[PDB]
Design a protein around this ligand. Structure first.
Ligand SMILES: Cc1cc2nc3c(=O)[nH]c(=O)nc-3n(C[C@H](O)[C@H](O)[C@H](O)COP(=O)(O)O)c2cc1C
Ligand SMILES: Cc1cc2nc3c(=O)[nH]c(=O)nc-3n(C[C@H](O)[C@H](O)[C@H](O)COP(=O)(O)O)c2cc1C
Ligand SMILES: COc1ccc2[nH]cc(CCNC(C)=O)c2c1
Ligand SMILES: COc1ccc2[nH]cc(CCNC(C)=O)c2c1
Ligand SMILES: [Zn+2]
Ligand SMILES: [Zn+2]
Lengths: 229, 229
């Protein structure tokens, strides 16, 4: 049996991102997987890392240290319920798919906020207690990203540089750091500029890939994979 | 004369980030510069990119496209006032300093939200009108980042890889894309693990650098600068 969490960050259900999230639910549900979706915009998910993330009394109310406070709150079961609800979904998942449009070579702020607030010390990693000593080892993660720029722009000699260059903070700095095994990213280039048939083709390629997702090996999440030849 | 905008993202005024922001205000004010600070957490700055960012009739209310709607809203002067207030500060600034702790090899979500919402099409870039032709051409930008990890961890052979690797989405994908000339980053490594004297030393090195900031040349914001080869 297999459980999947899809963390989805798009405002418009009729969007191309919406279509990719819906075909992932459809395909994984067809396989008999247990599927949960965190639709961040529909949840009005809080992105800001603030003292409202800890309930009750702070370890040090005079000098607020977000990392220290959330690490202690996690251990004391005093984190805000929106964070713990997401942590329960991650803890139970075997695969976490992130579905989002690329915003400034990174995730939209609402999804950056999910990463900042949900992946706290004690839950996803400890200090020390990261990368392969991370706490989400055994779990798979996958970035399903859509872009405005064409594939050609995202080549080593292209204006944007290779698409792997922007994946480093997300795949390595975040997912690998927490102990996830990183599956190859799904990059859907320039859907708004594509034809209706080309968009249908991109959606079908993602659905087809999901049919055999449990047979994939993760990428070697190294500097060489992201920046080398 | 010169005008500086400091976009600051830290919850705690007593923090090391707070000390760096304050010494920048002190030094630039001593030089006779005009200084403005956007303290994002104190402003409870909205990070989410939503339809609340447009006040008028949407160009397409049936299928919401944030990029299209904000581009049109910028041209019509129908953007939310919190965005327009930040744009006025950026338009007037000769130098924009971003002061923040590194969160997941990137900016905290509240600051990612400032980038997503403030740097809209029509204001910060256009198509064509990006990279060396970006609309913020002639302006300088500088990232002043603090980290948990030591300098040694942020080297090519270190666990985190070189610090320049994580700068790519911010310096190139965002600042250079909008036409800014990027000054060399100020990276204050591991202040929480440092001694009180070492922290004082990092604050003084930043103040000393600011004394001659107007004499600096920008970096060559290229893939070669960030990744080598
Ligand atoms: C705030 C913002 C920032 C964006 N930044 C990028 C970027 O860095 N690179 C890129 O290729 N496209 C960028 N885009 C374009 C989106 O990635 C693109 O519109 C989206 O992936 C299309 O998918 P959708 O039709 O489902 O929205 C940006 C769009 C917005 C609104
Ligand atoms: C949500 C979160 C994510 C962080 N991610 C990183 C990271 O990617 N790399 C790093 O070296 N430190 C990371 N840190 C540690 C902070 O960068 C560090 O505590 C801060 O820069 C210290 O400055 P301050 O004392 O003024 O807060 C993170 C902290 C938090 C709370
Ligand atoms: C809440 O603190 C966080 C969150 C995510 C993180 N990624 C990297 C670090 C730096 C940790 N430094 C050492 C020496 O262990 C980190 C800290
Ligand atoms: C670094 O590339 C960026 C940064 C911000 C952006 N906002 C919107 C787009 C592209 C939107 N699609 C087209 C081709 O019009 C975009 C690209
Ligand atoms: Zn890695
Ligand atoms: Zn560049």
């Amino acid at each position: 049996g297999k459980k999947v969490l899809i963390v989805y960050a798009h405002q418009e259900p009729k969007s191309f991102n919406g279509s990719l999230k819906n075909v992932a639910v459809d395909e994984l549900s067809r396989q008999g997987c247990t599927v949960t979706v965190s639709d961040l915009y529909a949840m009005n998910f809080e992105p800001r890392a603030t003292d409202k993330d800890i309930t009750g009394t702070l370890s040090n109310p005079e000098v607020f240290n977000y990392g220290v406070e959330t690490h202690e709150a996690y251990k004391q079961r005093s984190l805000a319920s929106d964070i713990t609800d997401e942590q329960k979904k991650v803890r139970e998942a075997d695969l976490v798919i992130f579905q989002f449009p690329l915003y400034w070579f990174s995730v939209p702020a609402i999804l950056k906020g999910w990463m900042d607030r949900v992946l706290c010390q004690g839950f996803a990693f400890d200090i020390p207690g990261f990368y392969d000593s991370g706490l989400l080892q055994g779990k798979l993660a996958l970035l399903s990203v859509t872009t405005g720029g064409t594939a050609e722009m995202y080549t080593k000699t292209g204006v944007n540089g290779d698409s792997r260059y922007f994946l480093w903070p997300l795949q390595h700095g975040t997912l690998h750091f927490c102990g996830f095994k990183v599956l190859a990213p799904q990059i859907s280039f320039a859907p708004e500029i594509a034809s209706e048939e080309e968009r249908k083709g991109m959606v079908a390629a993602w659905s087809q890939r999901l049919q055999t997702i449990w047979k994939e090996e993760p990428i070697p999440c190294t500097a060489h994979w992201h920046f080398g030849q």
